[PDB]
Design a protein around this ligand. Sequence first.
Ligand code: HEM
Ligand code: HEM
Ligand code: HEM
Ligand code: HEM
Lengths: 143, 146, 140, 141
Amino acid sequence: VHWTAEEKQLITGLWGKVNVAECGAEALARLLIVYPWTQRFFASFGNLSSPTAILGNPMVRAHGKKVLTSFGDAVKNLDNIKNTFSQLSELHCDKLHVDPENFRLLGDILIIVLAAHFSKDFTPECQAAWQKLVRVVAHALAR
Amino acid sequence: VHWTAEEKQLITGLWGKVNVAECGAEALARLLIVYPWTQRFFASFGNLSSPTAILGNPMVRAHGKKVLTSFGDAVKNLDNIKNTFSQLSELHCDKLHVDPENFRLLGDILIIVLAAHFSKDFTPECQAAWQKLVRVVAHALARKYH
Amino acid sequence: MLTAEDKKLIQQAWEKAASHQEEFGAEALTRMFTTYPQTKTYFPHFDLSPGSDQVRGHGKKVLGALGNAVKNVDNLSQAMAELSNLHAYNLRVDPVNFKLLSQCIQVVLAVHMGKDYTPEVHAAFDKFLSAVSAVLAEKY
Amino acid sequence: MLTAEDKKLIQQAWEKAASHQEEFGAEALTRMFTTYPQTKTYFPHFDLSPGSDQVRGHGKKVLGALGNAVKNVDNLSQAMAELSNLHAYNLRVDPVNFKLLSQCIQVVLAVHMGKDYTPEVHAAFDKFLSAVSAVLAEKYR
Ligand code: HEM
Ligand code: HEM
Ligand code: HEM
Ligand code: HEM
């Protein structure tokens, strides 16, 4: 819960170059295809029968964007993340019953998405700062 | 951390009949034998080459008692657990680097120990209350990772 | 991986459960639903009352499967085939839940075997259950 | 254990890594030590400096093993035998750590394959790594 100047920098800087919509769709899409059991929470999305159907699915793509957009809320509230994700916690936990292990799984995927989109610019130091952010957001959601 | 009267009751009542030393030794012993990788944190204990050696090992037995004794600190501090386990958090996290998944593994074992020691008296409601306590203590200990 | 000796232990642990399938199975599910409420989500069609004919009926089917698992403990994937397909593909059961049922089954055994549920038996049974859980989330 | 078409995907993905073993391996370990500091605990004898001859030397051995895993992706248990014995028995590596290395290896691939690290390849590689991780903690006792 101790954010260093270096970390905040690494996080903010990179965030500014993120294509929220494209990365969000890729993160959510990858989640559903790499960890299939997660599809059961998204039945109202329609066709999720193949990676192809999932990638092209309008709601997956539009949902992913909403997901990454909230991460952006964490990016500009790093010291007040818990308070920021309280409501979302209730939703995922009370209303939806999403096991927390899944939150971590999405974070890991997001990290792999950012890496494929920034290549070498995604330095080990950068990875470490993002992996920390992801871990913090996952814990904020599992309150 | 919303503790109900029923829960506090089920926790306190059962605690009063626990043989701290015997259950503690069994919990810690089972941990080391069911999840072997955990032995690497207890090399200074000596012989842990067999379940037999582990069960008879004086330090395992004496350590287990210390572990269950702290749980007892949680039992009489339910509303102030986090503060109670802060220091222990630093130790397990900073000084020792014990992955949190292991904390949960010990809790599960403790639950199985209590069940073998109280049988039918360990009701599903009772189990649920203890499993909650274990989860809370594990989270209190994992404060130094974040 | 599953040893020779463990096979003997789980067989002697089983011999105990084998005669109380309906009760043990029912108690296992009841403990899971009670301790891990989130699991109820998979049985919206069931009456989750403790004495439910449904719960009991299911519990009996669960322990029956484990029994057959024991019998074919040396080729679980080809025996649990149908079940992994159901749980993975049809039901989409989050793998985290298999750990939850496994702990509850073990609590039931400890409650009824008391001192006889020794570190050695505990260890052999824990491997068996984790192995079975692995084969159930082995498709998709 | 493994699938089929996935075997082709991981083989593709591998052909990329196979030519940069020393670099990819070294980057993988460096990322792990950097992101998950706790892992350093297993290498008290190593110089964990990013350009360490040791790290690079190890990284090359790690990726070499994975390569042989790919070649025998259909009998993993009997090939990684010596390695599971070392990691489980001798080292007592907590299984949680295998997940950590696996993610780092994947980050290295994504960084160098960019768009080519597709959901399909990602999925096949993730299965392969998890499978390999399982066989390494198979002797867990
Ligand atoms: C740590 C990452 C996560 C974040 C930040 C996050 C964020 C969000 C947000 C912002 C919404 C709100 C939708 C709205 O109000 O319009 C949402 C909804 C939801 N999320 Fe999450 N989520 C996360 C992880 C997950 C995971 C792991 C799953 C399950 C595999 C999941 C399943 C869902 C579902 C089913 C909904 C409701 C969708 C609907 O409204 O139809 N989320 N998520
Ligand atoms: C959630 C359950 C846990 C509790 C409540 C707990 C509690 C304790 C306590 C009270 C001590 C302090 C010793 C002292 O000051 O005299 C201790 C030490 C230690 N614990 Fe934990 N512990 C837990 C889980 C674990 C786990 C999972 C491991 C690792 C597998 C572990 C490894 C150790 C080690 C190696 C020490 C230091 C032993 C020494 O002083 O030589 N503990 N634990
Ligand atoms: C590791 C232990 C497990 C075994 C051996 C097992 C076994 C069974 C069996 C034999 C069936 C019924 C087959 C049939 O009638 O066609 C079944 C169905 C099912 N199981 Fe499992 N199961 C296991 C774990 C779980 C878990 C952890 C969950 C999820 C929380 C679960 C949820 C269900 C559901 C919802 C069904 C469908 C029930 C129905 O058709 O009404 N099972 N299980
Ligand atoms: C899943 C990927 C893994 C593979 C394929 C792998 C492979 C290797 C290989 C081939 C060796 C050296 C064999 C020799 O020189 O005799 C080795 C040794 C070792 N590995 Fe692993 N490893 C893996 C995961 C890990 C993880 C996650 C850790 C722990 C954080 C770890 C810690 C070590 C250590 C400390 C050694 C001993 C190094 C030495 O002898 O100085 N490995 N590994």
